Amino acid sequence: VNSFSGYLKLTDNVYIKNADIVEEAKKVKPTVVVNAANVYLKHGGGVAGALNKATNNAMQVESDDYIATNGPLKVGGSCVLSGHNLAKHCLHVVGPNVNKGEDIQLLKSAYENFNQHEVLLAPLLSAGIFGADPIHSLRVCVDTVRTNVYLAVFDKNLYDKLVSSFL
Ligand SMILES: c1csc(C[C@H]2CCN(c3ncnc4[nH]ccc34)C2)n1
């Protein structure tokens, strides 16, 4: 028994809610919150810019040191950094950017990173400003992640659409 509240159960291991991931994180303080990162860990908008603002820019400061030491992530890759005031850890995961010509099959690789963590609070990936279809994306999540994932969907019309169209 964990502390997530109000989620709809989609499968044995996937749960969903119409919620802002930042508000969910502040309330639950989960072991792992997933960020929808880019390869440079430049947190400008969407999930990344909202989480980072909620950390008072501490996430960006930590991220810039990570990049200076290690170089960029791979599309489909991830790194574990601090969760600051939002979670114990933040798993920064890079989904493909279809508006950069990046292969959408890399979305499955991106979700595979979630399997290294028993429980996660996460958004939908190479959703929002990353330009992917949020049906196909939910489907890849369900068919790839085997650990327990709590999805926070910010847009109400996407959520109602995702739930009503979920096979
Ligand atoms: C509607 C318009 S763009 C879009 C797709 C993604 C971009 C923003 N995303 C979030 N997901 C969960 N919590 C969040 N909090 C802030 C942003 C956000 C999903 N949904």
From Swiss-Prot:
The chain holds residues 1025 to 1191 of 7096 of the full protein. May form homohexamers. Interacts with N protein. It is found in: Host endoplasmic reticulum membrane. It comes from Severe acute respiratory syndrome coronavirus 2. Responsible for the cleavages located at the N-terminus of the replicase polyprotein. Participates together with nsp4 in the assembly of virally-induced cytoplasmic double-membrane vesicles necessary for viral replication. Antagonizes innate immune induction of type I interferon by blocking the phosphorylation, dimerization and subsequent nuclear translocation of host IRF3. Also prevents host NF-kappa-B signaling. In addition, PL-PRO possesses a deubiquitinating/deISGylating activity and processes both 'Lys-48'- and 'Lys-63'-linked polyubiquitin chains from cellular substrates. It catalyses: Thiol-dependent hydrolysis of ester, thioester, amide, peptide and isopeptide bonds formed by the C-terminal Gly of ubiquitin (a 76-residue protein attached to proteins as an intracellular targeting signal). Residues 1-167 form the Macro domain. It is a multi-pass membrane protein. Inhibited in vitro by GRL-0617. This is Papain-like protease nsp3.
